[PDB]
Symmetry: C2
Subunit: 215 residues, 2 copies
């Protein structure tokens, strides 16, 4: 992705989301849109963004339902124009395969979320994350999401998926993660509040990229 | 809930969803709406259903994000008129507490999903489900979701949460679960495809209710 930086656009009203994305567009080319924005303004916001900014859109829906429902959610998400969707691995392989089947039918991609970045991820997810990552490899998943807040876990994830897999990582900035350290293992970093709540989002994005370039 | 039966309305077309829900309204009073319908027709469908059918609406979003994001999703969901939202427990206690805080602020309810009903739930979720249920009790959760497809697990879940907690259960019909057996432990059963893909949804709902009444 451009500058290895993905904007997590979690503002909830269209005017603010459009203003901030437009202000930082010169520094990125991939925007992650999730339920805060889609449930507030509608799924049409995906195609509007894609067209307006000519960026790739990753739908952060972190799908975690039964196979049949996950299928329907993936189909609606790609029909809406998303280039990829993030899917939880903890519900198991059949739930993940349902998403991979729809992505294969629609020419899109699935990102598998393995371990989450917040504190509560240590309770149940962390203990299963290595096995969720290995399930991903066994299913042929090539795109993964791991935590910037725990670089030792991000390193172990990278170890399991290999160097050819693509790995993006949230938790940089607000949650405590560091851009440079995270980029030792991930291919791109996801950044939301550090940029979109900043007084000058473009300056915040530029400052992050400056540290990245130095790597 | 009326007749201990909740309709899972996962059709993706507004006209079909309104037709089927209207046909079975005399047998239920609680409709569960999830992302298949909301992402296809918009969040306004929740208020439309609530008004048109005068039914309670449970949002099956099975939220599984970090705390801050789960807060935003819950806020948007209750602003849309939902009476309750289903939240995954696997991401940990802070993620669940964020949802409980918004429900407290808005006068609504959270249902905690403990073990899922599909085959893949056996890989990672089942091993953590008893603890996820005990975490719910510790957080003061009073509404839970457990699997019709594994009544021995539903019994263990009921054992942990006590008789005062409200327990609803999906996987009846299409997934293989039985109404009567599931109602030995759950307070209400969720039914989707067995009713909404039936040639006569009202007759399908009626036949289920006749088996329930006889318990």
């Amino acid at each position: 992705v451009m500058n290895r930086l993905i904007l997590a656009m979690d503002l909830m009203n269209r005017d603010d989301a459009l203003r901030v994305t437009g202000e930082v567009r010169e520094y990125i080319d991939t925007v992650k849109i999730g339920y805060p924005l889609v449930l507030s303004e509608g799924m049409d916001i995906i195609a509007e963004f894609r067209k307006r900014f000519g960026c790739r859109i990753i739908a952060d829906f972190k799908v975690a339902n039964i196979p049949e429902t996950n299928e329907k959610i993936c189909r609606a998400t790609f029909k809406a124009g998303a280039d990829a969707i993030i899917v939880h691995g903890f519900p198991g392989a059949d739930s993940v395969r349902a998403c991979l089947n729809v992505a294969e039918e629609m020419g899109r991609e699935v990102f598998l979320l393995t371990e989450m970045s917040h504190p509560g991820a240590e309770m149940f997810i962390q203990g299963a994350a290595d096995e969720i990552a290995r399930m991903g490899v066994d299913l042929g998943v090539k795109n993964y999401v791991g935590p910037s807040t725990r670089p030792e876990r991000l390193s172990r994830l990278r170890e399991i998926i290999g160097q050819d897999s693509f790995l993006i990582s949230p938790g940089v900035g607000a949650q405590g993660g560091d851009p440079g350290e995270t980029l030792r293992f991930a291919d791109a970093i996801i950044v939301g509040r550090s940029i979109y709540l900043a007084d000058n989002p473009a300056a915040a994005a530029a400052g992050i990229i400056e540290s990245i370039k130095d790597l």
